[PDB]
Amino acid sequence: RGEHALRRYPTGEERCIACKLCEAICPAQAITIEAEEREDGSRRTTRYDIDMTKCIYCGFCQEACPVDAIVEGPNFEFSTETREELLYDKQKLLENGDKWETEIATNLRTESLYR
Amino acid sequence: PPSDHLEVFVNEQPVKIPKGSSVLQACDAAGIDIPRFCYHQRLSIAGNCRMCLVEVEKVPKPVASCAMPAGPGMKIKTETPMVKKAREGVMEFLLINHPLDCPICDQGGECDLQDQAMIFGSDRSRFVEAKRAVEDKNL
Amino acid sequence: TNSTDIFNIHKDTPENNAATSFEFSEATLKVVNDIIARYPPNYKQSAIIPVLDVTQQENGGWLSLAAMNRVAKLLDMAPIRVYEVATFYTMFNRTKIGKYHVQICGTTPCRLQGSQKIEEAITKHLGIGIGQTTQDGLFTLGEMECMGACVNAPMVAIADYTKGVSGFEYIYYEDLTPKDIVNILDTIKKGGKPKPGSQYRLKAEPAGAVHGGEKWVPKDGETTLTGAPRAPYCRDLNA
Amino acid sequence: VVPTFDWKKVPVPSTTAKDIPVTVKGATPAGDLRATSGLGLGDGIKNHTDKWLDGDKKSPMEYINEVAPIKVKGLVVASYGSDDPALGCPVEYINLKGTSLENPAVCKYTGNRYYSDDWKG
Amino acid sequence: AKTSFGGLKDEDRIFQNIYGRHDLSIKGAMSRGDWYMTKEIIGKGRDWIIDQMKKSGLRGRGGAGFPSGLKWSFMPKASDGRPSYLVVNGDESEPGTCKDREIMRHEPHKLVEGCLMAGVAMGARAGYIYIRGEFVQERRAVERAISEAYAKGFLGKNACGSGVDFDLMVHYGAGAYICGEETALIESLEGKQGKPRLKPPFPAGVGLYGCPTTVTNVETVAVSPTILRRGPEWFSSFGRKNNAGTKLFCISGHVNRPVTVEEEMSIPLKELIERHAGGVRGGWDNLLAIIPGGSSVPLLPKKICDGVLMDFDALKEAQSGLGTAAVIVMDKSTDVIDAIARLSYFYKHESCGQCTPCREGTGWLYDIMTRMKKGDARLEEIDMLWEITKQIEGHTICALGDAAAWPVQGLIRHFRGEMEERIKSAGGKKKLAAT
Amino acid sequence: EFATASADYSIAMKKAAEITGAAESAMGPKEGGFTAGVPLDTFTRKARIYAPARTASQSGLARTVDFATTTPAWKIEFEPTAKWQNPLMGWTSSADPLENVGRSALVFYTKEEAMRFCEKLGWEYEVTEPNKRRTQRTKRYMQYGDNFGTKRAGVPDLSTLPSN
Ligand SMILES: Cc1cc2nc3c(=O)[nH]c(=O)nc-3n(C[C@H](O)[C@H](O)[C@H](O)COP(=O)(O)O)c2cc1C
Ligand code: SF4
Ligand code: SF4
Ligand code: SF4
Ligand code: FES
Ligand code: FES
């Protein structure tokens, strides 16, 4: 359970559908979500924040997600010099997922036999 | 008045109700809240969801409590094995064609179907066939 | 629900839209007004199913949106009730069909007698499956449930829409083989009248049977009501 | 008796009428009411994607619009979003009758589009 | 008391022209005894006709079997402000059943006189006949008989010169099997979809147009004038106790001579099939199963059939029912799972969709049966199938849900070994690809 | 016979509330706030004593005053104070210490219990009695049999019959 990340389908569409289950289960209340409907009618988020200085790195959000959108990736080396660099918004989490997608998929090909 | 309030028995407890009341209203006056999907207080009675099924003495079938009138000296049972089996079966029939839509549905969190499935239904399904799909409507 | 009607909602077509016109003729309006008089005036809505049937022969074998709206205005009821009735019942076609509507029974008493081979013969001859119309607009193939002719299984019903309301014919053809239904279809196509009822006996009287769906095999045995009919009689109602 | 009401003579303020959030074709009729919340109103942002994406970066909606609809034989299709059903979305059963390449049916989970040439058309 | 039943004489058959051999006009019917002494029977009284119908032991020929004399007596005896209605059920959409077609096509004057007798017996001012919409020529023949009965003054004001008023009308449906149910028939006759009402209320209390109403079968109505003329003691001399009278039987399927034939009740199946129908195709030892009462009752195997009487209180103890007495015969070449699967398809197709268990579970039963036909199932799915039928049955608004559960119950009960062998041997063609 | 939730631990909670000597404990007005040790300006705020109505989205009645003797349903609520947005992230900021304490933690069986708590703590209170549900249905559609009655269009006139 490392740095949180947001994932896509192979087409390039976001997996997240703003169900707010990960926000409800979070014991630290480290997630803040706002949503409305997109211009094509889809149900998508407009804000998805994770306070990494409030997070406890439990993985409960990863368990609660029904579409495998939020994960905790294999990155542990993400120390910064300012605390404002650790208040992640939606764009940075998507950038993390776009960085770590192949490793996350390799990990999930094994861990889907157990979960 | 010729006894305008009649006495029924809900789980061996005597309950006085006004005349013309149904079995469901007698259960409500006894402090029991019967599961329902098609009954409404402000609408006419339909009787089509089959969720309000209770047991009445000397009746071999479950009765629909929303529509069945309450007679004098009637004995209503709401917690026998046939009532619980009826509730689980009717819930299972309600859920076989329903879409797996709770993450994208707006009723999630305040849904009668979800909460009644959690309380009066089972925890599993045995259905592996294809579901019914319906196009949406513009209103 | 039947064949040929996969939608329970209205689909716009150049033939079928809200701009399309329907109106009764004089004789059909006489028929419809005679139907309405069978029922109380404050319960005039009871007449919807026969009126919709008469409208279906008038329009040519199917109900359009304009026909349903005309029937709704005629019986002074909301159109959604008319749409409910028209979509609920199996005989009401809501898309355009051919001139003759061929309907085959597929329920188990007809199925044991070989209705599947009759369906195979019809599809091999006419070249269409269930739910389809021929390219000439002559025949429409459909499937039905039990038609109440099970002792003369396997059977086909054929509906005639080429003469309008006055010459509407709904004819049962019973005790069939592939040759019998091929001959009936050829007789209809050539302009003749094929013989109604059973092809090897008169009625539901005891005679042979279709063996395997391919050959009639006659069989002799005991037959009742072969003598003279009974005389009138009554007991003494006094005591 | 009971005269008809003329809705076309009803006045609407021009500031309100020009600010209605509507939709492109997608999963609705084009031009129906689009639900919005208050986020971005102080910064004058009326668009869904601009509320969280900054720059000329390729949006997720522009990614899914480049994938063509998929021809499926039958009347109903099951959508998982993956080859492996464990790795995708909960299964979505999408109606395919009345659908074509021009007016396909869309999955509410994945945004993939499907149509069928099997409904006698 | 007689012990052996069957071999009914031609002089005791009620329907003397069930084959349409004789003249079908009103002169042929009046010369054959119909419309005879009708004014004298009506002048006896309402209570007299009720008592005479009670003493006959005639039960409902629609499929349930309720006593007709007590049923007709449920109608009110005085005036409150509403008229009363007779409605006669001529739907006959039960698979296998084709007796009412013959009664409506070849003996309609018996039906019309019985409508008059029943309407007088129940205080009804008007009457409706609900004929099947597929029965077009039968409707035309019934309307011809009604026009003829009006032209001689038998129907209308001062009917048969008796002082009682009765009118008869013809309604027809448009192809729904569920419209054979009573309250569904009333709902379709009122100008709506054929969806049954919940009981209570009962049609004799609140029926058509909110008025007292009795729905009765064509065959129940038609035998009443012959019973009133020839006596209740004559009618009750046939069949066992509480099982009185004669019955039309329709024999279809794998039979050498399929037939609609009238016979005494409590006749054995083997007697009823070997005589009057030429026996089972290929001999009696080629029999596999028989449905004795249409389609809504469970099937019976060869061991039960050899010995059982075609009777109300005899098929019920054999875990079946008499129903409409429509007999469907299958032989040893029949895939009985495929036959009951097509029956499941019928009940899926004919569900009206009003209530949850029927509407959702008939399709589920059909899907499970379709998988069972190919053997693509598990052995415990048979017990699941029994559980699902027990979940539908007794839990719905009307009796089509029970009628959908019952054939699958009979198939499981009498041929579970066939279903298990179908599952086991399918893996001889499915597990050769897994390895 | 007596059976009012007689199969759970709530029997052992109703008694232990009526133990002698402890069932008659009482304090003067505002005295419990002096010994509570929280700042005294907190008791200058106003409180509302009320039982919340059933949500419109659902039909169940468990969180209402219908089950008042079974479940505590009366609440204490306070008026809102200022909220604003965080400049860096946009999160909702507040300076209210009583922002969720009445809605999460304080529940009472009756109205008088909540009043007693407010009186001993020093909060000034207003009490709102909930609106009572009506169970009697309309004259039309009173029973299921009134759907099919003669009140739809009156008694049918028999003047379109043959022979009139
Ligand atoms: C699904 C269903 C279909 C029925 N179809 C018929 C029918 O076609 N003809 C009939 O007489 N009764 C039919 N019935 C039975 C009627 O509801 C009713 O009990 C019967 O017609 C009363 O006639 P009786 O005089 O024989 O008692 C059907 C019942 C059900 C549940
Ligand atoms: S890992 Fe735990 S703390 Fe971090 S976002 Fe998920 S639930 Fe919250
Ligand atoms: S990340 Fe998953 S759980 Fe969280 S809102 Fe999006 S879809 Fe729901
Ligand atoms: S059992 Fe079937 S036919 Fe009868 S009311 Fe229910 S859904 Fe309709
Ligand atoms: S509440 Fe639906 S059947 Fe009674
Ligand atoms: S099964 Fe074909 S007519 Fe009945």
Side-chain angles (χ1 to χ4, degrees):
Chain A
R1 330 208 283 265
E3 190 178 27
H4 298 50
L6 280 172
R7 275 180 87 230
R8 294 169 195 256
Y9 287 110
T11 73
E13 174 74 275
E14 320 165 353
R15 276 150 180 279
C16 177
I17 46 173
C19 68
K20 290 161 166 273
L21 293 180
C22 61
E23 197 206 88
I25 193 65
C26 199
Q29 286 205 344
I31 309 184
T32 311
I33 302 180
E34 294 205 28
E36 65 192 33
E37 62 156 338
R38 209 198 273 168
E39 283 91 18
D40 57 353
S42 182
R43 173 186 171 119
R44 302 295 162 175
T45 52
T46 51
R47 161 190 269 160
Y48 190 87
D49 296 332
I50 297 183
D51 199 327
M52 307 295 285
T53 78
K54 223 179 291 204
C55 182
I56 80 173
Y57 298 79
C58 46
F60 281 14
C61 65
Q62 200 179 16
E63 301 170 4
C65 193
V67 292
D68 305 347
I70 188 68
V71 294
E72 288 204 79
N75 191 35
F76 53 94
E77 289 143 336
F78 63 115
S79 65
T80 70
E81 298 203 352
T82 68
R83 186 177 159 199
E84 293 93 359
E85 280 166 65
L86 291 171
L87 305 195
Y88 289 11
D89 59 352
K90 174 167 170 176
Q91 190 177 342
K92 184 179 175 61
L93 289 158
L94 282 174
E95 192 198 350
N96 281 340
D98 302 347
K99 283 175 54 63
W100 297 100
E101 185 45 56
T102 77
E103 191 156 42
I104 287 164
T106 316
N107 277 351
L108 282 181
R109 263 186 267 107
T110 303
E111 199 47 41
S112 66
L113 309 179
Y114 297 94
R115 276 174 195 174
Chain B
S3 74
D4 272 21
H5 298 305
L6 74 164
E7 297 151 338
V8 299
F9 286 90
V10 190
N11 294 319
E12 315 294 293
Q13 280 95 33
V15 172
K16 295 181 196 292
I17 49 179
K19 282 214 172 209
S21 307
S22 62
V23 176
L24 187 153
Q25 304 192 283
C27 287
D28 199 275
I32 303 158
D33 193 73
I34 295 290
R36 45 200 187 272
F37 276 117
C38 61
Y39 178 72
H40 203 263
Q41 168 72 47
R42 323 263 187 218
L43 307 182
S44 71
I45 300 163
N48 64 77
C49 81
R50 308 275 100 189
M51 205 43 177
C52 71
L53 293 186
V54 303
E55 162 159 31
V56 179
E57 285 193 3
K58 303 178 288 188
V59 183
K61 284 203 301 179
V63 307
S65 45
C66 68
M68 173 85 226
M74 185 172 274
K75 310 270 167 70
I76 297 91
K77 294 148 170 30
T78 65
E79 42 194 12
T80 58
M82 55 174 278
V83 175
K84 298 188 173 82
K85 192 44 206 180
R87 279 175 189 165
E88 294 197 4
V90 168
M91 175 57 58
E92 176 182 38
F93 287 138
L94 269 175
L95 289 184
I96 43 168
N97 282 313
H98 204 82
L100 277 73
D101 265 12
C102 293
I104 49 172
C105 189
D106 285 331
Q107 282 293 108
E110 48 176 8
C111 192
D112 280 331
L113 186 51
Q114 268 187 337
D115 301 337
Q116 286 189 43
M118 279 299 299
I119 295 163
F120 308 102
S122 177
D123 47 14
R124 283 164 174 84
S125 79
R126 34 196 189 185
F127 181 79
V128 294
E129 318 297 323
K131 303 180 173 271
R132 153 199 66 208
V134 178
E135 273 293 320
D136 313 315
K137 274 76 177 172
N138 308 130
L139 296 174
Chain C
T1 187
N2 45 18
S3 295
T4 70
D5 266 325
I6 208 62
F7 292 109
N8 285 328
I9 57 152
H10 173 64
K11 289 296 180 187
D12 277 331
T13 310
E15 196 191 5
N16 197 5
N17 52 2
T20 306
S21 69
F22 178 77
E23 195 65 41
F24 293 113
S25 65
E26 182 64 39
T28 315
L29 199 57
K30 288 305 199 57
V31 167
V32 169
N33 288 132
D34 287 333
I35 283 180
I36 282 171
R38 297 171 189 172
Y39 308 101
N42 46 356
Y43 292 101
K44 196 173 73 166
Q45 294 82 47
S46 296
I48 182 170
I49 296 100
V51 160
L52 275 176
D53 171 69
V54 170
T55 312
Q56 202 199 0
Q57 293 92 23
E58 169 72 28
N59 200 256
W62 63 285
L63 290 155
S64 69
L65 185 49
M68 280 182 271
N69 284 126
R70 177 66 184 101
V71 169
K73 297 185 308 159
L74 179 51
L75 289 179
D76 207 359
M77 62 207 299
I80 183 66
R81 314 283 165 255
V82 181
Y83 306 144
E84 277 180 319
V85 174
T87 53
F88 189 82
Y89 291 97
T90 54
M91 280 185 238
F92 290 148
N93 303 117
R94 284 164 308 108
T95 186
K96 177 202 183 48
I97 63 167
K99 293 185 282 271
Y100 299 98
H101 193 23
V102 169
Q103 321 178 297
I104 188 167
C105 179
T107 317
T108 310
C110 276
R111 198 184 160 94
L112 299 159
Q113 289 291 93
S115 74
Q116 284 179 329
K117 272 167 183 172
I118 293 177
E119 178 184 359
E120 187 75 32
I122 292 178
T123 300
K124 200 215 162 195
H125 193 83
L126 290 188
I128 53 164
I130 296 170
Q132 304 185 308
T133 316
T134 48
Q135 202 43 247
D136 299 357
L138 188 61
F139 285 126
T140 291
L141 188 48
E143 188 175 22
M144 271 285 173
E145 295 315 305
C146 166
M147 316 209 78
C150 312
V151 293
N152 309 91
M155 57 82 70
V156 174
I158 294 182
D160 187 9
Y161 289 114
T162 70
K163 282 145 201 152
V165 175
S166 276
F168 171 61
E169 295 299 318
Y170 199 63
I171 316 292
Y172 278 12
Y173 300 97
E174 303 157 13
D175 279 299
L176 300 163
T177 65
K179 310 294 190 169
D180 301 330
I181 186 64
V182 160
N183 285 319
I184 286 170
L185 288 172
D186 278 311
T187 302
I188 294 180
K189 182 187 172 69
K190 280 190 180 200
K193 295 194 189 206
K195 49 167 196 186
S198 176
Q199 306 290 296
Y200 301 99
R201 42 168 165 158
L202 314 171
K203 288 298 157 62
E205 76 257 6
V210 189
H211 274 55
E214 90 265 359
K215 162 186 296 300
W216 173 268
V217 179
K219 188 70 179 293
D220 304 338
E222 163 185 359
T223 301
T224 193
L225 296 175
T226 57
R230 192 166 162 82
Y233 166 71
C234 187
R235 77 202 149 101
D236 187 75
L237 321 167
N238 294 334
Chain D
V1 68
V2 285
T4 75
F5 186 82
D6 214 344
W7 282 108
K8 292 215 191 83
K9 305 304 179 292
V10 177
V12 180
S14 192
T15 51
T16 310
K18 289 195 298 289
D19 202 73
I20 317 294
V22 290
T23 61
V24 310
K25 186 175 206 191
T28 44
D32 60 340
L33 194 52
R34 197 179 59 90
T36 49
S37 63
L39 171 62
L41 276 175
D43 296 310
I45 304 170
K46 309 289 183 289
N47 185 29
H48 182 278
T49 303
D50 283 2
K51 290 190 199 211
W52 62 272
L53 206 45
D54 274 344
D56 284 338
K57 290 166 168 56
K58 207 176 162 178
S59 83
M61 186 175 44
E62 297 171 353
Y63 268 113
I64 199 62
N65 282 341
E66 293 178 353
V67 193
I70 304 167
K71 180 152 204 170
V72 169
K73 295 186 308 296
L75 302 174
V76 189
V77 68
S79 182
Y80 305 90
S82 169
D83 300 281
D84 203 300
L87 294 166
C89 67
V91 64
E92 190 73 30
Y93 282 97
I94 310 159
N95 187 27
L96 298 186
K97 69 189 65 163
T99 60
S100 48
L101 186 47
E102 290 77 54
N103 295 333
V106 62
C107 181
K108 298 206 199 310
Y109 275 97
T110 69
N112 295 323
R113 283 175 300 160
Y114 310 90
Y115 70 101
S116 181
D117 282 336
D118 273 26
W119 52 286
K120 309 290 197 295
Chain E
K2 195 169 72 162
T3 45
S4 68
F5 308 96
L8 177 71
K9 294 172 299 318
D10 286 331
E11 54 264 33
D12 268 336
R13 303 205 198 276
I14 289 173
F15 305 106
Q16 302 279 347
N17 202 8
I18 209 67
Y19 290 141
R21 189 168 59 91
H22 297 145
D23 175 66
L24 292 177
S25 54
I26 202 166
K27 65 179 72 66
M30 278 187 75
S31 73
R32 281 188 304 269
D34 303 324
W35 289 114
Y36 188 45
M37 304 292 284
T38 308
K39 162 176 166 171
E40 285 84 356
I41 295 185
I42 289 166
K44 288 304 287 183
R46 177 168 165 194
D47 299 287
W48 187 90
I49 296 165
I50 291 299
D51 180 40
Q52 292 304 295
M53 292 299 293
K54 269 180 178 177
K55 284 184 178 199
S56 51
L58 169 82
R59 283 150 73 102
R61 302 303 204 252
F66 202 82
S68 305
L70 194 64
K71 184 182 164 174
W72 293 6
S73 80
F74 287 157
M75 302 295 286
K77 284 286 189 305
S79 167
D80 54 352
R82 314 177 283 158
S84 308
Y85 282 93
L86 171 58
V87 182
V88 180
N89 195 346
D91 211 45
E92 194 175 70
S93 310
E94 288 268 334
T97 310
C98 52
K99 53 177 180 68
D100 295 347
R101 176 205 195 178
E102 302 297 316
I103 301 182
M104 284 184 299
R105 198 171 39 165
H106 293 147
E107 205 56 54
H109 294 278
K110 266 184 177 135
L111 176 58
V112 175
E113 194 189 356
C115 286
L116 178 60
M117 294 296 187
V120 164
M122 294 184 273
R125 171 70 180 90
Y128 288 90
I129 307 179
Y130 194 100
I131 312 180
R132 195 180 170 165
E134 280 105 351
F135 286 174
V136 163
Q137 293 82 17
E138 292 83 357
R139 154 157 54 100
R140 283 168 190 177
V142 163
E143 286 168 319
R144 280 180 226 127
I146 285 185
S147 309
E148 285 176 297
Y150 271 109
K152 307 187 91 85
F154 295 155
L155 303 172
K157 295 209 185 197
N158 198 236
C160 294
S162 52
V164 301
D165 307 352
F166 183 74
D167 276 288
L168 199 54
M169 277 79 63
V170 167
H171 191 93
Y172 60 99
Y177 159 73
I178 187 49
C179 282
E181 208 267 350
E182 289 177 352
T183 56
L185 191 146
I186 293 180
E187 285 276 307
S188 179
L189 181 50
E190 265 171 348
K192 280 165 299 194
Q193 301 173 112
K195 302 194 170 183
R197 319 166 166 187
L198 275 77
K199 295 187 289 292
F202 299 94
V206 178
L208 184 71
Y209 310 138
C211 294
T213 297
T214 300
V215 185
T216 43
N217 187 242
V218 172
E219 192 196 13
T220 310
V221 164
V223 299
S224 300
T226 312
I227 284 171
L228 288 179
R229 289 194 278 264
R230 293 192 70 176
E233 293 84 3
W234 168 85
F235 196 69
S236 50
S237 49
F238 300 100
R240 298 205 293 187
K241 298 295 292 296
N242 208 38
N243 296 271
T246 179
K247 186 90 185 61
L248 266 167
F249 298 94
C250 314
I251 309 161
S252 59
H254 299 134
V255 167
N256 297 303
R257 299 147 39 89
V259 64
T260 312
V261 67
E262 183 176 352
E263 201 66 28
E264 185 187 31
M265 214 169 286
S266 306
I267 180 178
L269 279 170
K270 195 173 188 162
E271 184 172 345
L272 190 61
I273 289 176
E274 278 193 341
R275 90 189 287 180
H276 290 303
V280 182
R281 216 172 284 164
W284 182 262
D285 299 308
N286 218 14
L287 178 60
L288 188 89
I290 280 170
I291 306 170
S295 175
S296 66
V297 291
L299 60 84
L300 304 170
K302 185 178 184 292
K303 277 74 69 177
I304 299 279
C305 281
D306 200 1
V308 71
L309 316 180
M310 276 290 314
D311 193 1
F312 279 114
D313 291 344
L315 284 170
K316 181 172 79 70
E317 272 77 3
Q319 312 206 260
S320 186
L322 187 153
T324 64
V327 172
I328 296 156
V329 176
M330 302 153 260
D331 57 352
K332 303 200 160 181
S333 64
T334 312
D335 200 319
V336 68
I337 307 160
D338 177 86
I340 307 300
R342 194 43 177 83
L343 283 195
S344 287
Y345 183 81
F346 169 82
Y347 281 114
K348 164 179 149 301
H349 190 278
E350 290 316 300
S351 172
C352 83
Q354 184 176 23
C355 61
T356 304
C358 185
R359 169 190 80 243
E360 304 294 337
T362 54
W364 196 9
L365 290 179
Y366 172 63
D367 272 325
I368 292 170
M369 284 290 289
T370 306
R371 272 202 289 116
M372 287 292 176
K373 170 196 164 183
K374 292 180 276 291
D376 201 356
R378 273 79 195 167
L379 294 170
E380 301 89 3
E381 267 178 305
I382 295 173
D383 277 300
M384 193 194 59
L385 180 49
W386 179 275
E387 180 74 51
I388 290 152
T389 60
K390 279 295 159 168
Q391 278 160 216
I392 295 183
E393 158 202 349
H395 292 95
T396 59
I397 294 181
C398 84
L400 192 150
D402 309 79
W406 286 340
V408 191
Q409 276 169 17
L411 178 70
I412 284 169
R413 171 169 51 228
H414 292 301
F415 289 104
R416 196 207 204 92
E418 186 69 30
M419 281 161 80
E420 288 175 351
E421 162 88 342
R422 184 72 52 92
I423 289 174
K424 275 150 180 177
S425 289
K429 267 83 65 180
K430 295 303 288 295
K431 235 172 179 168
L432 296 178
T435 54
Chain F
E1 59 93 21
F2 296 94
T4 51
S6 183
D8 52 346
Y9 185 75
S10 78
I11 312 155
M13 291 166 103
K14 297 312 192 307
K15 60 193 68 169
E18 50 196 14
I19 284 177
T20 184
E24 211 183 351
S25 304
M27 266 198 290
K30 308 182 173 182
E31 298 295 319
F34 293 148
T35 72
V38 299
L40 192 65
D41 59 281
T42 316
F43 306 124
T44 61
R45 299 178 66 159
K46 307 296 179 185
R48 262 193 71 234
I49 288 157
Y50 83 112
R54 185 191 49 87
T55 175
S57 301
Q58 299 200 244
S59 190
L61 280 166
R63 202 197 290 174
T64 49
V65 74
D66 285 357
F67 301 96
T69 53
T70 303
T71 316
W74 288 82
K75 297 295 288 175
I76 288 168
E77 289 289 274
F78 305 105
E79 277 161 320
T81 312
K83 295 165 184 163
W84 63 98
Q85 314 293 326
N86 170 240
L88 175 70
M89 293 302 289
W91 299 331
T92 310
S93 307
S94 179
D96 199 357
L98 312 174
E99 192 267 329
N100 49 56
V101 73
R103 56 185 288 190
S104 305
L106 300 192
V107 289
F108 296 90
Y109 279 99
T110 71
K111 154 193 62 182
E112 286 89 3
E113 283 168 12
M115 289 160 97
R116 194 184 62 221
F117 203 69
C118 283
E119 274 192 2
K120 70 178 185 182
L121 267 184
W123 278 324
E124 179 69 27
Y125 61 94
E126 182 173 0
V127 53
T128 305
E129 189 73 31
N131 296 130
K132 195 174 73 166
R133 191 258 307 272
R134 281 191 66 245
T135 309
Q136 172 181 358
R137 308 168 52 79
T138 57
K139 294 209 207 153
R140 187 95 172 86
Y141 321 120
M142 167 79 67
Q143 293 171 40
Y144 180 75
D146 304 340
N147 291 319
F148 315 111
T150 195
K151 291 183 283 189
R152 326 206 295 277
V155 175
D157 46 343
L158 309 174
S159 293
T160 47
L161 293 176
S163 73
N164 306 324

